[PDB]
């Protein structure tokens, strides 16, 4: 919505701002991809014991 004015500099500022949040989102998405795969195996071990 901010690009409507026609000043692309503020658009560049916002786009450069969101990149840190994108990087953080990817960083957490990487960690979840392995924690989810590990908790299942722990649950299986408990079930057999």
């Amino acid at each position: 919505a901010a690009l409507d004015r026609g000043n692309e500099q503020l658009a560049r500022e916002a786009l450069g701002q969101r990149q840190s949040y994108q990087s953080h989102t990817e960083a957490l998405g990487k960690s979840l991809g392995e924690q989810r795969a590990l908790v299942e195996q722990v649950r299986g071990q408990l079930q057999k014991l």
């Binding site: 901010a2 503020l10 500022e13 916002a14 701002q17």
Partner: protein, 43 residues
């Protein structure tokens, strides 16, 4: 007093001046558009 004022500011960071400029611009756009519609509707 200043120590406590800064210490509570550290825990919850204040918003960036860029955010304040953006929200001020949004408010100005909203009020300008609304007053334009105000002038156009009675006409």
């Amino acid at each position: 007093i200043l120590e406590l004022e800064a210490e509570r500011e550290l825990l919850n960071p204040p918003p960036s001046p860029l955010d304040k400029k953006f929200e001020q611009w949004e408010e100005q756009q909203a009020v300008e558009a609304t007053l334009a519609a105000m002038k156009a509707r009675r006409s």
